[PDB]
Amino acid sequence: PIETVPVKLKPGMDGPKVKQWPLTEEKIKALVEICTEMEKEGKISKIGPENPYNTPVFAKLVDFRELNKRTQDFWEVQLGIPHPAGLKKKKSVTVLDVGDAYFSVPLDEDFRKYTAFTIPSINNPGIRYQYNVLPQGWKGSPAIFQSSMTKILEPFRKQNPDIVIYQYVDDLYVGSDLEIGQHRTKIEELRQHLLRWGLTTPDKKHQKEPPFLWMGYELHPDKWTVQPIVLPEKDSWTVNDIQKLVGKLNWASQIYPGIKVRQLCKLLRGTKALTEVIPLTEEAELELAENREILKEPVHGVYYDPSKDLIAEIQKQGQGQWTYQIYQEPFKNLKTGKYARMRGAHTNDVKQLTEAVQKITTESIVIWGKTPKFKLPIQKETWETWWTEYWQATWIPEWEFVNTPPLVKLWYQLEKEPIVGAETFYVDAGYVTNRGRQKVVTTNQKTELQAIYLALQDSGLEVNIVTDSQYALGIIQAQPDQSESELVNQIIEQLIKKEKVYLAWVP
């Protein structure tokens, strides 16, 4: 019937030789009825004492741990899964359950001898068998089956370029844009194509109907969403509850715009046990309530229409927080999202926004096979200035400035040349200015930034600063506007305050 896939054991390894655990006469009974029905259907066949391999059977379950450890590797079952926002709308979508998946697919003739197992006798031998098909629980079954499935489908597919089929382990999602009756016709046409291969499917009235809850999503043929999340109404929250809450809040962000978890997240600081109860902060309940609210109103993701453009829009939600949404028709979201990723202890919004663009870009190629046109709250001048002067290579695709505050800008800029008539501070924790002044006021690296801070404090609106620290130099030259370190942030505060600042390094 269906082509056989050549299997082999890993190199320099012999088949399994594991002893059958002792069995109940009651259990021996049942296995023999089960293994007799199976030999009549060809799935297995009695073998002689020629075969020295054996796998454990219990009550019918065959333990293939050993054989699996010894079987070769196969190509990756379901590398990744599609994201609902990358689907094209359908009038009808039918899910086809496939029972006896493995049992209708033949096993490499030269491999069967390794699938041998034994049914113990009740009276002081026990029957010996081997598989002629793909055994449930075997390493390669899932793959050999996906692959096989694919082959069977190909035809049907070439004769119905309209229908779209997605294979998901044992399910089969079949959509189209056929008039209601027509769709059902094709579906039943498919069901037979699978029958001509001993593959069985559910009858129209036994089939699950839209929406389909999939991997945390709720799917219709025309619009999508994630399966309804309910926010608890406790008065006592455990570290665990908060983790799960944040977890779920998170998952929703891909479609529910406005979800925030910062305040809830802050609750895990210093916790000492998963069962520790943390009381909610004023800001934390305000956040929960806001979410609980946003959630109350269901929102539906819309599917992809390839004849139209992909628009990506990004907004700054807070310090280090970004939100974006991708759509084709205004506010008609295919998908939304957040980005909090801080790469490096220090950064500026310009760098961060760029990283957001990149994540979004990557994601898009994966979901739609192309990049979106971006709408960004930064002007080309601002962008260009930073790009033009940053040591790292970077690139941002087609983007259009959007006047949607907050706009990202550079809070400060280091003079490219020393300043005339601006005092000069020499720092190494203390300074010595050229005008006589001085102050000799922690990790090595943190003592360095301390100096610089001092100098900034005591200086006027213009300053020239010389330091030997290549570190601080690096830091400040990258013109961060936000930092994990408090010191820095104070320095940054200073920086923004000045009129002109020139920093220089000396050995």
Partner 1 sequence: ETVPVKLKPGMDGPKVKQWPLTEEKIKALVEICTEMEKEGKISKIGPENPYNTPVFAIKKKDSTKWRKLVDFRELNKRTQDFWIPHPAGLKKKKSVTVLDVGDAYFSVPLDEDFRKYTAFTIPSINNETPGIRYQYNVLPQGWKGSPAIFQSSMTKILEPFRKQNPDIVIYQYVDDLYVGSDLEIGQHRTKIEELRQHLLRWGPPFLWMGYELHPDKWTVQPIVLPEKDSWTVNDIQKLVGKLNWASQIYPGIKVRQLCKLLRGTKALTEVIPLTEEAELELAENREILKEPVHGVYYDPSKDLIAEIQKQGQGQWTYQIYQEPFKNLKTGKYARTNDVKQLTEAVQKITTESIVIWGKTPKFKLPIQKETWETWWTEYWQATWIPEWEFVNTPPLVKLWYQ
Tell which one of 129, 173, 322, 412 touches ligand NVP (CB under 6 A): 173
Binding mask 213-242 for ligand NVP (x = CB under 6 A): -x----x-x---------------------
Q: Is 390 in the site for partner 1 (CB under 8 A)?
A: yes
Tell which one of 15, 106, 142, 175 touches ligand NVP (CB under 6 A): 175
| Stretch of 173-181, 279-287, 344-352, 446-454 lying at the interface with ligand NVP (CB under 6 A) | 173-181
The pairs formed by 54-57 with CB atoms below 8 angstroms and a separation of 24 or more are: 54/16, 54/17, 54/18, 54/19, 54/20, 54/116, 54/117, 54/118, 55/16, 55/18, 55/115, 55/116, 55/117, 56/18, 56/19, 56/20, 56/21, 56/117, 57/20, 57/23, 57/31, 57/117, 57/118, 57/119
Q: How far is the CB of 173 from ligand NVP (least distance, A)?
A: 4
Enumerate residues 77-136 that contact ligand NVP by CB under 6 A. Answer: 82, 87, 89-90, 93
**Smaller CB distance to ligand NVP: residue 219 or 295?**
219
- Asked whether residue 349 is marked as a ligand-binding residue, the answer is no
Q: Is 382 in the site for partner 1 (CB under 8 A)?
A: no
- Asked whether residue 458 is marked as a ligand-binding residue, the answer is no
Measured at the alpha carbon of residue 90, what is the angle toward residues 87 and 94, in degrees to the nearest 5? Answer: 100
Q: Is 212 in the site for ligand NVP (CB under 6 A)?
A: yes
Q: How far is the CB of 51 from partner 1 (least distance, A)?
A: 23
Picking from 416, 494, 505, 496, the residue whose alpha carbon sits closest to that of residue 459 is 494
| Stretch of 48-56, 66-74, 222-230, 287-295 lying at the interface with partner 1 (CB under 8 A) | 66-74
The number of residues that bind partner 1 (CB under 8 A) is 69
Indicate the helix (H) or strand (E) that contains 467: strand 462-467
Binding mask 346-375 for partner 1 (x = CB under 8 A): ---------x--xx-xx--xxxxxxx----
Q: How far is the CB of 505 from partner 1 (least distance, A)?
A: 7
Q: Is 67 exposed, middle or buried (0-12, 13-18, 19+ CB in 10 A)?
A: buried
- Asked whether residue 97 is marked as a ligand-binding residue, the answer is yes
Q: Is 164 in the site for ligand NVP (CB under 6 A)?
A: yes
Comparing every residue's Cβ against ligand NVP, the nearest one is 175
| Number of Cβ within a 10 Å radius of residue 504 | 13
Give all strands (DSSP E) within 11-149, no chain letters: 44-46, 57-58, 61-62, 92-95, 117-119, 127-131
- Asked whether residue 305 is marked as a ligand-binding residue, the answer is no
Residue 214 binds: one of ligand NVP, partner 1, none (C-beta under 5 to 8 A by kind):
ligand NVP
Tokens of 436: 């006589």
Tell which one of 98, 466, 492, 495 touches partner 1 (CB under 8 A): 466
- What is the SS3 assignment for 336-392? EEEECCCCCCEECHHHHHHHHHHHHHHHHHHHHCCCCEEEECCCHHHHHHHHHCCCC
Indicate the helix (H) or strand (E) that contains 187: helix 180-195
Enumerate residues 104-143 that contact partner 1 by CB under 8 A. Answer: 140, 143
- Evaluate whether 123 touches 222 at the Cβ level (below 8 Å): no
Enumerate residues 244-303 that contact ligand NVP by CB under 6 A. Answer: 303
Provide Rg for the chain, Cα atoms: 33
Residue 328 C-alpha from the chain's centroid: 23
Residue 210 C-alpha from the chain's centroid: 25
The number of residues that bind ligand NVP (CB under 6 A) is 16
| Burial 345-371, CB ≥16 within 10 A → b, else e | ebbbbbbbbbbbbbebbebbeebbeeb
Q: Which residue is listed with tokens 């034994």? A: 118
Tell which one of 174, 473, 488, 491 touches partner 1 (CB under 8 A): 473
**Smaller CB distance to partner 1: residue 408 or 503?**
503
Beta strands 277-278; 237-238: pairing state: antiparallel
Tell which one of 421, 444, 460, 486 touches partner 1 (CB under 8 A): 421
**Smaller CB distance to ligand NVP: residue 47 or 299?**
299
- Evaluate whether 504 touches 452 at the Cβ level (below 8 Å): no
Residues near ligand NVP, by CB under 6 A: 82, 87, 89-90, 93, 164-166, 173-175, 212, 214, 219, 221, 303
- Binding-site positions for Mg(2+) read 97, 170-171, 428, 448, 468
Residues near partner 1, by CB under 8 A: 5-8, 72-76, 78-83, 86-87, 140, 143-144, 146-147, 150, 166-167, 343, 355, 358-359, 361-362, 365-371, 387-395, 417-421, 423-424, 426, 432-434, 464, 466, 470, 473-474, 477, 502, 504-507
